[PDB]
Chains A and B, each alone.
Chain A
Amino acid sequence: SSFSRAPQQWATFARIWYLLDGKMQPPGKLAAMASIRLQGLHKPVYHALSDCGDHVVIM
């Protein structure tokens, strides 16, 4: 992408903020989605030792 090395690293590992609406939703299905996002398991760069979790906001 022809980015500079430091900006490229910053973008790849950047934290994203996700919004989830909980109205009339079962907690487990909300929990299952939040679990994946909080661990970074939704990213192709995922590694347990990489702190690649994302922010999850549930209303």
Chain B
Amino acid sequence: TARGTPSRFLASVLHNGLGRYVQQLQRLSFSVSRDGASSRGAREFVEREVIDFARRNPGVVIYVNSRPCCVPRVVAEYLNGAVREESIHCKSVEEISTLVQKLADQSGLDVIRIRKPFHTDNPSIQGQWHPFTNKPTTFRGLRPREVQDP
């Protein structure tokens, strides 16, 4: 580590979910080799899984670029500008399906230590405690060992 890494507070993008839910993932870019053992899973994912995913997530634009590559990758871009590149090297279709759905559900905020597991903009309904919250008032606001009619 906590001391060796950054941290942030629990947050959302544009108060997502308050009025309506917006999927933060907007773009997925796949790089797949036509030939290449490491791209076998990615090629199979494109044949039988990408089309169904695209229909399920119309908000996300999916670019599939087939070109020579040793390490196939998926670049996920979010509405808040976050860019997250993942490797699908030698991953099976099920593993790629899991990773892609995981990217779809993430908000794009940095995956770093979150200080509190809760966030509220209105912590108090009855008034935040202060030293006088539970102190009684005194007649004429006299202090300890103070004399009225000085």
A residues near B (Cβ < 8 Å) are: 1, 8, 11-12, 14, 16, 19, 43-45, 54
B131 proximal to A (CB < 8 A):
yes
Asked if residues A14 and B131 are in contact (CB atoms below 8 Å), the reply is: yes
B127 proximal to A (CB < 8 A):
yes
B residues near A (Cβ < 8 Å) are: 124, 127-132, 144-145
Which B residue sits closest to A42, measured CB to CB? B131
Residue from B127, B128, B130, B145 having most chain A Cβ neighbours under 10 A: B130
Taking chain B's interface residues, is the majority helix, strand, or loop, or is none over half, making it mixed?
Answer: loop
Asked if residues A19 and B129 are in contact (CB atoms below 8 Å), the reply is: no
A11, A12, A19: the one within 8 Å of B144 (CB): A19
B124, B131, B144: the one within 8 Å of A1 (CB): B124
Asked if residues B131 and A8 are in contact (CB atoms below 8 Å), the reply is: no
A-B contact pairs, 16 of them (CB 8 A): A1-B124, A1-B127, A8-B128, A11-B130, A11-B131, A12-B128, A12-B129, A12-B130, A14-B131, A16-B131, A19-B145, A43-B129, A43-B131, A44-B129, A45-B129, A54-B131
Which A residue sits closest to B126, measured CB to CB? A1
CB distance from B145 to the nearest CB of A (A): 7
Which A residue sits closest to B134, measured CB to CB? A44
Rounded to whole angstroms, the CA-CA distance of A11 and B132 in the bound complex is: 9
